[PDB]
């Protein structure tokens, strides 16, 4: 029955056609050419890059007899963007915004039995976005077949009002929809699963619902000893919420959630009772080589990423994420700023959100509110980034505040905030006070004065130095930027900037940094990220790590192929009290870090945040050696001159992979010499074949000036290293064989085996 099914994939088997064809909506349409895929999809990644025209989508299906007299529904996650969508031709559905998710009744007009043709037509714009948006379907579908009584979308709501280490309250709001034609009062069972899957504590509750209306209800359960959701241990709980007409179940549906509590002073914000500081990064929605259709591992992997950098906290730069993206911040234990829009009512782009502001604004924040308000990660509703309406001096205020107003009276369990980039217009403007928590864009040289101004907001860096780099670039002393990490735009500086007024105005919660992970644009990608399009670190990733994380380490650029007669710069970034440079044996000194500063060139900067040695190139190796203040070896790192590029090494982050269709290994691809050193500007064509269980499906390399295909089976290496990307087949286990192959260089293989 219906009774069992929360909502299954609709994902498969549909037909795809990019381009203008009249009556595409319709039930008797050939489409026999178009085409053949399986959403998630994003056409935009070729398939800064082309985003806008025409593209549709169909799908045929058989009404299946269990569906007779049931609400059936399909639910789009994401659809990018201006998305019409159309049953057996009746159109049923109108979705501007790509980024919220939404749902179209077909129950009236579904055929049992006989065919029916699901039909969208998405007509993305030119000049829409300030980021890659990519284009399509780029999200999940789902089919929900329910019985008449039922939970409708986002139809549970899980707040923790107490929390402590003893007893934590769990209280649940349950709304039904009552589609019969006779009033009813319906039990509800509430199952509260733990990480093993067993069931530790149940709650019941009932509704009374009339003939075709909606009911809510509340209700609170304690639990004891409950296994609170932190960073270090994120543990996750599971709802089981099932309904009953009698002794009819009626509908199932699930929710994940977590139990912690959150608070947040003008001096601070609070997790679990202890003050939380942001070592925080921005990211935008796509994966780079992957493109934006969801993929968990690709979204995994960079959050992984980021961990190992020391990030705790995420600012969903500038739009909603797919839920599997917060999922995944749920079960890795980041805090989250998930933001609404980007503009409001005044126009960044010709086609941008206020286009519709003024007839979805409330609908979409609702839509996203209703959606993520159970996820643990989630910290604060950000209503908007840099939005023109910052210095309307009048009038400003009213649009912050009305979007303020909608996340208190939906949410008032997490604070609202906002992205500032203008200064002091939002402060002196009376904007920043309609939002609990006020974030400044590049605005480190002020936190001390808004303080003395405003002494009672509280504060936080929302978006921070927007410095750039190419990954493995060295200018000394174009198309790239150097990897010494100096240059940026007129508001960029160097992290060093960001950390020292922050080490300076403790009341300031953190920093969000512009950005994480490079990220696709409209040169076609950034240079803003500490790891690179493709995820290989720059030397930016080892700073950030140096000043956000516990575990000793150290880092050493530039590499050490130079030409002899050479002054070489060499920094070194780590957590340790001193450290020691060698070059083949010789001591060129020791370095205490906040003591033998480095003069960064912005006027130029004092830096305590790294240590910095002038050597004289001479050929062989280079070695640093970080010590504590007792003078014991913690860590140490040697680089060394490569020769000519003789050989490619190829290193799977992961041997075993998911037979699921949809789970990925990132192959780094190497361009080693004769002895297996990297040769760290190598940039030659590498091509590759998949063969058995799986496949090719893209490659990659960090490079922002290249033009390169990223779904060819080739790629060229950039600073010596490119990224190939696998795949498995659904359902199809076994050994997936790669061979890697390059012009004049020793051929490279691996295996990925392939389970489940």
Excluded at 537 to 547: A, E, G, I, V
């Amino acid at each position: 029955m219906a009774s069992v099914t929360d909502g299954i994939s609709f994902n498969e088997n549909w037909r795809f056609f990019k381009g203008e064809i009249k009556g595409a909506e319709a039930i008797s349409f050939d489409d026999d050419s178009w085409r053949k895929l399986n959403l998630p999809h994003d056409w935009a990644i070729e398939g800064g890059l082309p985003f806008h025209g025409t593209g549709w989508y169909r799908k045929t299906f058989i009404g299946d007899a269990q569906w007779k007299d049931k609400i059936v529904r399909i639910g789009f996650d994401g659809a990018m963007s201006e998305a019409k969508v159309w049953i057996n031709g009746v159109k049923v559905g109108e979705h501007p915004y790509g980024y919220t998710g939404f749902e179209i009744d077909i129950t009236k007009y579904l055929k049992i039995g006989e065919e029916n043709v699901l039909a969208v037509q998405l007509t993305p714009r030119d000049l829409s976005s300030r980021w890659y948006p990519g284009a399509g379907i780029y999200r999940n579908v789902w089919l929900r077949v329910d019985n008449k009584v039922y939970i409708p979308e986002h139809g549970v709501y899980v707040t923790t009002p107490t929390v402590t280490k003893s007893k934590a309250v769990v209280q649940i709001e349950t709304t039904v929809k009552n589609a019969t034609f006779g009033n009813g009062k319906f039990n509800i069972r509430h199952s509260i699963i733990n990480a093993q899957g067993e069931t530790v504590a149940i709650l019941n509750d009932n509704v009374e619902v009339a003939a075709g209306e909606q009911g809510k209800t509340l209700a609170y359960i304690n639990m004891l000893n409950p296994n609170i959701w932190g960073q270090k241990n994120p543990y996750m709980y599971k709802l089981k919420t099932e309904i009953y007409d009698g002794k009819d179940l009626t509908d199932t549906y699930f929710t994940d959630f977590g139990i912690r509590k959150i608070c947040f002073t003008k001096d601070g914000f609070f997790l679990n009772g202890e003050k939380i500081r942001f070592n925080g990064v921005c990211l935008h929605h796509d994966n780079g080589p992957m493109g934006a259709a969801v993929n968990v591992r690709a979204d995994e992997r960079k959050l992984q990423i980021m961990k190992e950098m020391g990030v705790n906290a995420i600012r969903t730069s500038h739009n909603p994420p797919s839920p599997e993206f917060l999922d995944l911040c749920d079960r890795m234990g980041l805090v989250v700023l998930d933001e609404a829009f980007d503009e409001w009512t005044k126009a960044k782009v010709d086609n941008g959100y206020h286009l519709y502001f003024d007839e979805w604004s409330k609908k979409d924040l609702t839509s996203l509110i209703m959606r993520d308000r159970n996820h643990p990660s989630v910290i604060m509703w950000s209503i908007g980034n840099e939005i023109l309406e910052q210095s309307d001096k009048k009038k400003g205020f009213t649009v912050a505040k009305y979007l303020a107003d909608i996340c208190r009276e939906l949410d008032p369990t997490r604070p609202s905030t906002c992205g500032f980039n203008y200064y002091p217009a939002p402060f002196d403007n009376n904007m920043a006070q309609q939002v609990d928590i006020a974030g400044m864009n590049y605005k480190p040289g002020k936190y001390a004065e808004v303080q003395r101004l405003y002494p009672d907001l509280p504060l936080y860096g929302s978006e921070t130095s927007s410095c750039t780099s190419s990954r493995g670039v060295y200018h000394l002393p174009t198309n790239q930027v150097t990897s010494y990490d100096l240059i940026g735009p007129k508001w960029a500086y160097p992290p060093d900037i960001e950390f020292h007024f922050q080490e300076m105005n403790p009341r300031f919660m953190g920093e969000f940094i512009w950005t994480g992970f490079d990220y696709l644009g409209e040169s076609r990608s950034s240079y803003f990220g500490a790891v690179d399009l493709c995820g290989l670190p720059k030397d930016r990733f080892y700073l950030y790590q140096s000043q956000w994380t516990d575990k000793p380490m150290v880092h050493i650029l530039p590499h050490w192929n130079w030409k002899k007669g050479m002054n070489i710069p060499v920094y070194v970034y780590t957590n340790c009290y001193e450290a020691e440079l060698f070059l083949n044996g010789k001591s060129l000194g020791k370095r205490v870090k906040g003591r033998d500063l480095t003069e960064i060139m912005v006027n130029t900067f004092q830096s305590k945040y790294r240590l910095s040695w002038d050597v004289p190139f001479e050929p062989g190796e280079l070695t640093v050696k970080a010590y504590n203040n007792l003078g014991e070896l913690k860590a140490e790192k040697t680089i060394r001159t490569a020769g000519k590029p003789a050989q490619i090494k190829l290193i799977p982050d992961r041997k075993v992979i998911t037979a699921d269709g949809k789970d990925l290994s990132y192959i780094t691809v190497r361009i080693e010499d004769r002895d297996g050193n990297l040769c760290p500007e190598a940039d030659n064509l590498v091509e590759f074949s998949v063969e058995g269980a799986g496949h090719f499906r893209a490659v990659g390399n960090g490079n922002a000036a290249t033009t390169e295909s990223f779904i060819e089976p080739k790629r060229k290496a950039f600073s010596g290293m490119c990224m190939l990307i696998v795949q498995s087949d659904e359902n199809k286990q076994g050994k997936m064989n790669i061979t890697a192959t390059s012009k004049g260089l020793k051929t490279a293989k691996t295996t990925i085996n392939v389970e489940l």
